[PDB]
Amino acid sequence: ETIRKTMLKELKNSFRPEFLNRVDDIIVFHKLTKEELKEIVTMMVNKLTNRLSEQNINIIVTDKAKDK
Amino acid sequence: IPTVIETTNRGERAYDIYSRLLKDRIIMLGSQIDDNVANSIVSQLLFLQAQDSEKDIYLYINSPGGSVTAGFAIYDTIQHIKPDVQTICIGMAASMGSFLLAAGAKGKRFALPNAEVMIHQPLGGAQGQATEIEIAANHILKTREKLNRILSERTGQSIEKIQKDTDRDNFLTAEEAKEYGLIDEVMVPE
Amino acid sequence: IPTVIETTNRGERAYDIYSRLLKDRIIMLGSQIDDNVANSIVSQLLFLQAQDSEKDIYLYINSPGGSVTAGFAIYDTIQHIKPDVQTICIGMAASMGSFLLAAGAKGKRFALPNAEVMIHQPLGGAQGQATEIEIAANHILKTREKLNRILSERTGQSIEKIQKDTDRDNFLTAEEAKEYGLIDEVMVP
Amino acid sequence: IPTVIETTGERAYDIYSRLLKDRIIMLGSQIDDNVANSIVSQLLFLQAQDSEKDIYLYINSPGGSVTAGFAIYDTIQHIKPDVQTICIGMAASMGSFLLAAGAKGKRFALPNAEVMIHQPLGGAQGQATEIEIAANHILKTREKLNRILSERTGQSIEKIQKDTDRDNFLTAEEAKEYGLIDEVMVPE
Amino acid sequence: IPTVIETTNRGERAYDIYSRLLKDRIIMLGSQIDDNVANSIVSQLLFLQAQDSEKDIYLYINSPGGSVTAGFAIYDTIQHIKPDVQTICIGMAASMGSFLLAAGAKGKRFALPNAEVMIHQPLGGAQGQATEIEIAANHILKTREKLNRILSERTGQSIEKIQKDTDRDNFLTAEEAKEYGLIDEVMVPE
Amino acid sequence: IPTVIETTNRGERAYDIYSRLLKDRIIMLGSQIDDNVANSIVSQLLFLQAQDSEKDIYLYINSPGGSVTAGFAIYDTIQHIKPDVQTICIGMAASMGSFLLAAGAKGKRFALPNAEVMIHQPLGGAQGQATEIEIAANHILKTREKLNRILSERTGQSIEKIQKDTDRDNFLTAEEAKEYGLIDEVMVPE
Amino acid sequence: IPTVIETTNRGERAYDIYSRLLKDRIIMLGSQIDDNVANSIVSQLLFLQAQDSEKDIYLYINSPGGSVTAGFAIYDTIQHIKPDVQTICIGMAASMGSFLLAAGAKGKRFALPNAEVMIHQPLGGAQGQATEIEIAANHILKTREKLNRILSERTGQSIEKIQKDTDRDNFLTAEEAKEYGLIDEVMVPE
Amino acid sequence: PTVIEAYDIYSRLLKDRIIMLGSQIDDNVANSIVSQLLFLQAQDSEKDIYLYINSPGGSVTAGFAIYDTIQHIKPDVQTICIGMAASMGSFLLAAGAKGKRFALPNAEVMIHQPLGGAQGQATEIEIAANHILKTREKLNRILSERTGQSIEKIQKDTDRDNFLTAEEAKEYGLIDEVMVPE
């Protein structure tokens, strides 16, 4: 909550009030967490496994490898 | 001395706290009143008048006293400039500091609740031959007469009463100063 | 005193550590309270009130004390401004330091665990003729009475108890200060 | 000394530099060689700045070196801009000299201001011949000061010699009567 | 005090050596511990906690000693901030300096090989009436008791033994300090 | 010292007053002549010669005097540089200041109307054994003879007359300096 | 300290002479070794090791000596940091400076041809009761024992001969220092 | 004063490889001069360095450090004597490269034996006196080497204070030729 508030306040000091008044929505992107990074690794690995399976190469990545 | 960074649409500027206050037309008189301090105060007042001649100027006073001539220069500058000069007493306003406190515009002289002011006759010194001592004594007496006259004209009190009260060190509270006529009303907390 | 540099799109901000703390609404009282320090602190408080009149101002005290008039100026500025002033005692709070430590907002006066607080009657001096000595003594007694009145109003203790405790140098730990009512709670790590 | 921000030029000045931009030169300290050098530099720079407009000298000083005051007087008289002199606070010793050294009709004084005119100070030490030389020099300096003051005030040299024998304190009205200033600035 | 222009990316800003070391969470204590130094150290500790509440702070200590209250302020700030602080003894850590050396995170107190530490009772003075001397003596004795109690807690040694050892100036080498418990291990060279 | 803005057509340049004067080849000698002042003057003269070896350099003198060696260094630097050096006496030119005043180019030495020029034999001191006192006295006499020789060369007056007039402190006005040969003409006010 | 300007591929940047030398990893020790100078030197060493941990560091020593604590702090910092520290003797390296002269890496301890080095037994003082003087004397003797041990290890020379040559002031020329073992080779001019 | 084109005047002179030695030669000034010499060697190691000397003297160790730095660096060092050069200042004036030591027409130089002090026990006084004699011997040996003069004559002239003008500096070998105005 405070991080969003302070980033929004800092944004107002870089752009004109009438420019920010015309934006439909200002969205603050939160920092990636541990499980989110694990899921990102999972999704990239899944994409790579599909792309190598279309070449008929079967590949599996263990959880410890993904965490590393 | 702390440094203030203020962001504005025009850009970002670095102020020190006293210049940041001066931006809002506030002048800090917080030291012994000598030639250099009086010169700085006169320069600040003149610049504030130059910037625009209708808004108010705020003088915050916390001084133990100082030179009579420097205080007279400050008072004359205050009386000569068109914009009104509000005087607020922070902490202690003694000797010529209290004299400058009464120099503010009528209805605009302020003091904090637990603030103290002190009024007395000016100090001085004479050395050398009897004629030289006579000259210096005449000068100091005339200075006392001028100070008493200005105080009587600004506080509404008789010249005799101010003569009696400034004989010794007179310590006045904010309420006592208000009833005496030095200030107009104390600053109630909000 | 180290220098802190902050980078933005607009430009560079070169704070010194005290100004960097002031950016977070931290005012440091870490020296003897004379006219210059009181003036600087009053100006800082006024600027912090101007910047935003609703958030809280933090005052850090580590000082042996100093001028009574300067401390009264700081106290008046603290009480006059709309934003609340939290007072945190780091190290020492003596004479005027303890008076300003007690002057913070209720429920918002703190002290570090092994911090020391000292309360005593003000010091002064009279010299010259008998009438002048009488004037100076009357002034110092009036000042002591005013300080005792404010301390009684602000700590919940009787004026007589504060008169008795302030006769000599009274050294109070954080727990004793909490029991005495000078501070509100000790800051556990 | 506070820092000043000019909103019309988004440019920063110190208060004395800001005043000097408006052709204001402040003499607010004891007049010694360094101060006189700075004042002469400012006067010459302002003469270079514009050949016509007036320079303003605000004096608040107890006095000082006679030679530095003579340098300032010579620079003021040499430059072709008119130099207005306004007495802020005290104009004593060589300060009162520079007060009467301004352009005729352009010498101002604040209402509650005081000026002092007196003979120059000095000292001698050593053999009789050296002390005689020093006394002759100080007498000649006093004579030159009296001559310039009589010329610039219109009063007789004898009267200036009589009045400057001791410390003479004059109010703004008394200085107006004497001739050192031209009139007193009445507030609005 | 040499300056350093080395900065990442733009590389335009210049630092002095201490400010540059501050960015690496390096804090230098190379002088007597008075109020100014203690205030600077507390401000640096708060700034480094704000910058990151998890990474460790590096505190290099080289001080003959100083005010007990200043050292107490530094100790409270160290024990209050979330990030751990490593104390590295450079040269001598004596009087309150040795107290701050023991104030580091457990298992994170180090000392260079040919370094020296000293422990002793606090110094002070008492002048005036007998009652005033009694008050000052009580205060200094309570201060010594509190210092001894904190040292016993942070070293795991009996307060009787610390009281006996702090009676006179006790000089200890790095190995002797390690055996005593003030530090954790001696930083062997590479 | 005050800071001035310049270049009304450019407006962006601000200099200190002496840097601004140095831009127009004005060098100020307005203090006692010691080693640092002489070094600064020599460096300024070298830079002015490097910037433009054709234009004339202006030297303003207001000094009670100083060391003989430093003033001699200034004299050497003045006489070695190709561009002409004009000397103007602001205020006083005493001791070696008058020597440097006479060191200007022929026909280009001016003095202000109420300017005083003082000429006298150099000062000194000897303390020690008889041989050391003799050595110091011989050196002082030699440097006085060198000063007299140079003054006679640049003033056209016999060295006996200079010896007689420099026995004591001789104070001369601008008119008397012109009659004596120290200056070329008094700068008449416009 | 003159300002020094270079034109780099990133534009024209300016430095002071000491910061410019520090850019090339040159550390100057040219004053008495007190706690402030030791703190500055240690900070510079830590910054240089953080910048690049493989390259060499250079220590130009022109010092008359200083405190034993500060010198030992610098010695420990030098022996702790991973990068090697070349040591070059400029002018005088006396007392603790000569100790820091031998602190450099073997094969990288240089000295100018007509330079002088000098080894002392550490100075000190004691005052108070007999017990306090006993403690101070024990501390001083142990400090000297440590100094002699480190000197023997670094110079490869017997402890007894160090005791003999250290009992009194021992001025050594660069060749004598090289033969003694304090330095490795005299910098022949090239 | 500030020189605008902005640099301080000494920085501007250093840009032209002009090094000013115009104060008492103590450790601070010696370190500054050594650092300037090293920077000038690094910036361009082929042109010539100019050292202007105006100093009453100072520490023997500082002057010897400056002498060693002058001898060690590859680019040559011309010495121009502005004003005075006394004790170590004259030594550094003699330290200039051959054919390139200069002196202004009415400049003055001083040569004399180094000053010192001793205090304490007889052994300590003996050590101090031996060191002072050794330092004087080193100074005389270097002066004899760099001026082509005999050791005995230098010893004789150095005993008391010896003022030499530019011409006496010329016939003494301290300077190589006087700078004629042009």
Swiss-Prot record, chain A:
Cysteines paired by S-S bonds: none
Regulation: induction: By heat shock. Transcriptionally regulated by CtsR. Up-regulated by heavy metals such as Cu(2+) and Cd(2+), but Zn(2+) and Co(2+) have no effect. Forms part of an operon with ctsR, mcsA and mcsB.
Domain of life where this protein originates: Bacteria
Role noted for this protein: Required for growth at high temperatures, probably by acting as a chaperone during heat shock and targeting heat-denatured proteins for degradation by ClpP. Required for biofilm formation. May act as a chaperone regulating CtsR activity.
Subunit structure: May interact with ClpP.
Family the entry assigns: Belongs to the ClpA/ClpB family. ClpC subfamily.
Protein name per its UniProtKB record: ATP-dependent Clp protease ATP-binding subunit ClpC
Origin organism lineage: Bacteria, Bacillati, Bacillota, Bacilli, Bacillales
Span within the parent record: 683 to 750 of 818
Curated annotation (Swiss-Prot), chains B, E, F, G:
Keyword Ligase: no
GO cellular component: cytoplasm; endopeptidase Clp complex
Keyword Protease in annotation: yes
PROSITE patterns: CLP_PROTEASE_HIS, CLP_PROTEASE_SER
CDD domains (UniProt xref): S14_ClpP_2
Keyword tags: Cytoplasm, Hydrolase, Protease, Serine protease
A molecular function (GO) term: ATP-dependent peptidase activity
Catalysis performed (reactions): Hydrolysis of proteins to small peptides in the presence of ATP and magnesium. alpha-casein is the usual test substrate. In the absence of ATP, only oligopeptides shorter than five residues are hydrolyzed (such as succinyl-Leu-Tyr-|-NHMec, and Leu-Tyr-Leu-|-Tyr-Trp, in which cleavage of the -Tyr-|-Leu- and -Tyr-|-Trp bonds also occurs)
Pfam name, any one: CLP_protease
Active site: S95 (nucleophile), H120
InterPro entries the UniProt entry points to: ClpP, ClpP/crotonase-like_dom_sf, ClpP/TepA, ClpP_His_AS, ClpP_Ser_AS
Main location: cytoplasm
Assigned EC number: 3.4.21.92
A biological-process GO annotation: protein quality control for misfolded or incompletely synthesized proteins
Localization: Cytoplasm
Oligomeric form and interacting partners: Fourteen ClpP subunits assemble into 2 heptameric rings which stack back to back to give a disk-like structure with a central cavity, resembling the structure of eukaryotic proteasomes.
Family: Belongs to the peptidase S14 family.
Function, as annotated: Cleaves peptides in various proteins in a process that requires ATP hydrolysis. Has a chymotrypsin-like activity. Plays a major role in the degradation of misfolded proteins.
Protein name per UniProt: ATP-dependent Clp protease proteolytic subunit
Taxonomic source organism: Staphylococcus aureus (strain NCTC 8325 / PS 47)
Phylogenetic lineage: Bacteria, Bacillati, Bacillota, Bacilli, Bacillales
